[PDB]
Amino acid sequence: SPEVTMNISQMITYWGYPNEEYEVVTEDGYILEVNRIPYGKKNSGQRPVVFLQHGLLASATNWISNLPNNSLAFILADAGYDVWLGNSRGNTWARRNLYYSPDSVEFWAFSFDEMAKYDLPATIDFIVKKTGQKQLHYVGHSQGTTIGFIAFSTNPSLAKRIKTFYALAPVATVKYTKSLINKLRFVPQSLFKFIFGDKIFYPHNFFDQFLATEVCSREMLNLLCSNALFIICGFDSKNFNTSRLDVYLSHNPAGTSVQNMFHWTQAVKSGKFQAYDWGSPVQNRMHYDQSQPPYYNVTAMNVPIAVWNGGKDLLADPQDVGLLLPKLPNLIYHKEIPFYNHLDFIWAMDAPQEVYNDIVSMISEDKK
Amino acid sequence: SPEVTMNISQMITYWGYPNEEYEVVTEDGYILEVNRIPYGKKNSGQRPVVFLQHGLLASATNWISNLPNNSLAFILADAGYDVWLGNSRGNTWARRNLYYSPDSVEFWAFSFDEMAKYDLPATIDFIVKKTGQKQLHYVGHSQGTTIGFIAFSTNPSLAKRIKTFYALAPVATVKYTKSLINKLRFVPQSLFKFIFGDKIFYPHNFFDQFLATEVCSREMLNLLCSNALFIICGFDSKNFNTSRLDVYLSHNPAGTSVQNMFHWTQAVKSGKFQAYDWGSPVQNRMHYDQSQPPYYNVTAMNVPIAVWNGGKDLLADPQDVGLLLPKLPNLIYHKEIPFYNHLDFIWAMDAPQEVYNDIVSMISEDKK
Numbered sequence A, B: 001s002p003e004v005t006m007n008i009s010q011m012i013t014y015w016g017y018p019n020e021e022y023e024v025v026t027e028d029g030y031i032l033e034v035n036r037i038p039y040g041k042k043n044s045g046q047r048p049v050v051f052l053q054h055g056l057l058a059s060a061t062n063w064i065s066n067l068p069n070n071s072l073a074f075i076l077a078d079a080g081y082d083v084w085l086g087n088s089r090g091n092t093w094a095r096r097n098l099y100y101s102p103d104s105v106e107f108w109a110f111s112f113d114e115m116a117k118y119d120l121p122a123t124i125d126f127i128v129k130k131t132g133q134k135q136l137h138y139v140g141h142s143q144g145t146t147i148g149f150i151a152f153s154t155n156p157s158l159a160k161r162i163k164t165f166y167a168l169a170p171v172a173t174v175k176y177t178k179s180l181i182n183k184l185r186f187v188p189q190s191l192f193k194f195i196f197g198d199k200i201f202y203p204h205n206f207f208d209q210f211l212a213t214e215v216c217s218r219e220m221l222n223l224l225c226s227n228a229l230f231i232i233c234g235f236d237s238k239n240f241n242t243s244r245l246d247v248y249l250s251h252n253p254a255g256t257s258v259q260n261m262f263h264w265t266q267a268v269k270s271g272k273f274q275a276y277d278w279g280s281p282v283q284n285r286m287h288y289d290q291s292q293p294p295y296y297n298v299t300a301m302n303v304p305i306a307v308w309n310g311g312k313d314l315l316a317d318p319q320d321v322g323l324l325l326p327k328l329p330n331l332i333y334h335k336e337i338p339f340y341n342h343l344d345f346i347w348a349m350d351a352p353q354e355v356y357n358d359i360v361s362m363i364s365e366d367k368k
């Protein structure tokens, strides 16, 4: 497929949709190139803003990786909205900073904490100011939702701008997962850095020794089994248009830091939902003004939220989701797709019938 | 409770709702008494029409059998609609025909084929003409949905009148069911008639010999275990208001024919979705002008449809529903309630929060 070697822009214009790139600069210096799809490729050729956040080890191209009839972003554009695809520090086209290079350790010294605290506010302020729209619709997947949880429950002025928070495969805690991500709990920082170093996160061979990895190798392409996106989010591609795997592989992950994965293993080990542990009381103070990483109050997140979770989701496992839902003040909708796993929400051929359609509707009764 | 001995009308007026009875006469001579609830009991005391079809071995009273706050028909009336409860040939108050008696064999020589071809068109024509409304909203449960599938995919003029088809526990095929209805596959016509005869269908003892029946007897009332509705659709009454069981038992089944059950066992045996096999090429010609029962093209059913299916539904099993959904051109919504079985859709205490409320909303955005 021709899109295997196309960047986000080319992939979008390839299907005849409009594309715009903007540069957002975070408070702490990161420069993020965000893409915008201002209107449909004819369908609905001022308009309400809808922001899409990809998840863990993913890419902003997730929302654009298939046919225009089954990719959230394209269908949302044809439905009459102004689609903005969020880009996080570290991933492709977001690897620059005013004060340090991508080749430095300092550049990658971040986790989702920073994404919520800096990347989101900056990107949205930009979008509001550029569009003049006072509010927008937020759609997050996987880690994208957890960014929202943190942001929206600690940034009132930001939260006020979101009229509805659509969460696909939510993740606040990760204490009951069936994901290979658990194997990392067996690893201390000392070892973590010796295995993966600082900077960009690559699986290396850490996972070959695991059963699930031998089973994968047996069934699907080696290419798939040695890709961190799948290793941590599931190898199952039953509901995928297997003709486009090479496209997902060539675009994910877009750029994840070793620190971020370590923050998640910290969560796998504690089962809580809290900020990153910088290593010591002194270091945590220099970041949180406390000696202990603060916890994230999911019940202080009031934005009206709709949740869609999978029954076969190994990362955002039903059990964890189970503990989450009740804590959500103002949960306006919930649906559990039994045969759906973590990545089905983005790449499943029936994702429009199972999820997307519902969102389009739900949105066209608030802002539009 | 007092409703145990009340007819459909009395049950309705018992809660302070208006009631009207109308006589519909099918093309082939059957006389059906249909009930109408023209408005709420105070709530919304001209209005859009919503037709409700009960399912296999059920009763039109299903939509009225509980409290006014959890019975689809009542809530629909209070929501401002004109509710019509369909009655099928054979069941209570639909056991008369211009040319033969209920005591004859000919009277019961029917299956859902006839319900779709004759009962539905006639009842709806009448409703249209009476209310002046050119369109209506159709809500089917169990076999009620299958009637719709046939009707709406073969009767264009009829289909045009349905703006939205709400399907609860859909059933086009029945080849992967966990229902005792499978045991019938072990039976040939010769034996079927010797065991159940023609005319009305009674369980007789055919099912006592089965495990699920011993387990039921062990847990619930014998009354329940020897009632065809539950034997074929599930004995589980966890989500029910168990204080009203005696009401369900005294009203179901309203009247099912042995021929209808044989049509369903034919389906269990073939795994397909097709018309009734009258027994021989000659007999089939005299009914379909072919020698083989025609098949029902579910993909020819264009009415916008919304589907709600249960995770623990033994009859409308997830697997079968699984094969159906993809075939539906124009499926506008889908939700699978994991803990719901076949009859939960009508009698579950949280049916309003799980299904009804979304239907009311969904409707109040089309016609009303």
Ligand SMILES: *[C@@H]1O[C@H](CO)[C@@H](O[C@@H]2O[C@H](CO)[C@@H](O)[C@H](O)[C@H]2NC(C)=O)[C@H](O)[C@H]1NC(C)=O
Binding pocket: A001, A067, A241, A243, A244, A349
């Ligand atoms: C699954 O992926 C394939 C490959 O992208 C899709 O088929 C192609 O669709 C594009 C766009 O219409 C055409 O230009 C190509 O000619 C098609 N064939 C091939 C071999 O690429 C297919 O439509 C996708 N979806 C499904 C359900 O098959």
Ligand SMILES: *[C@@H]1O[C@H](CO)[C@@H](O[C@@H]2O[C@H](CO)[C@@H](O)[C@H](O)[C@H]2NC(C)=O)[C@H](O)[C@H]1NC(C)=O
Binding pocket: B001, B067, B241, B243, B244, B349
């Ligand atoms: C379950 O059914 C019982 C009986 O139908 C309900 O309780 C009755 O409710 C009606 C009206 O609400 C009263 O007139 C009766 O006095 C109540 N008790 C009895 C013994 O009849 C009960 O509310 C229903 N639902 C639930 C959840 O309890």
Ligand SMILES: *[C@@H]1O[C@H](CO)[C@@H](O)[C@H](O)[C@H]1NC(C)=O
Binding pocket: A007, A008, A009, A010, A021, A033, A093
């Ligand atoms: C994609 O490639 C084109 C052509 O080489 C380039 O102009 C565009 O800027 C690229 N997209 C991004 C996000 O850099």
Ligand SMILES: *[C@@H]1O[C@H](CO)[C@@H](O)[C@H](O)[C@H]1NC(C)=O
Binding pocket: A067, A069, A070, A349, A352, A353
């Ligand atoms: C999108 O198009 C492909 C073929 O072009 C089709 O097979 C698929 O069902 C379509 N998906 C949707 C959601 O319409």
Ligand SMILES: *[C@@H]1O[C@H](CO)[C@@H](O)[C@H](O)[C@H]1NC(C)=O
Binding pocket: A297, A299, A300
């Ligand atoms: C969390 O948020 C709720 C609601 O604002 C509040 O009652 C509670 O005290 C907060 N703090 C903690 C630690 O839970």
Ligand SMILES: *[C@@H]1O[C@H](CO)[C@@H](O)[C@H](O)[C@H]1NC(C)=O
Binding pocket: B007, B008, B009, B010, B021, B033, B093
């Ligand atoms: C219910 O009973 C009443 C009084 O016995 C009767 O008038 C009414 O017609 C009955 N309802 C039906 C549907 O027959």
Ligand SMILES: *[C@@H]1O[C@H](CO)[C@@H](O)[C@H](O)[C@H]1NC(C)=O
Binding pocket: B067, B069, B070, B349, B350, B352, B353
């Ligand atoms: C209906 O009313 C009864 C009390 O009569 C209550 O216990 C039940 O929970 C209510 N259900 C709904 C959906 O309102």
Ligand SMILES: *[C@@H]1O[C@H](CO)[C@@H](O)[C@H](O)[C@H]1NC(C)=O
Binding pocket: B297, B299, B300
């Ligand atoms: C079934 O319906 C579809 C859509 O109307 C049609 O294309 C197909 O030829 C029909 N016939 C059969 C036998 O499937």
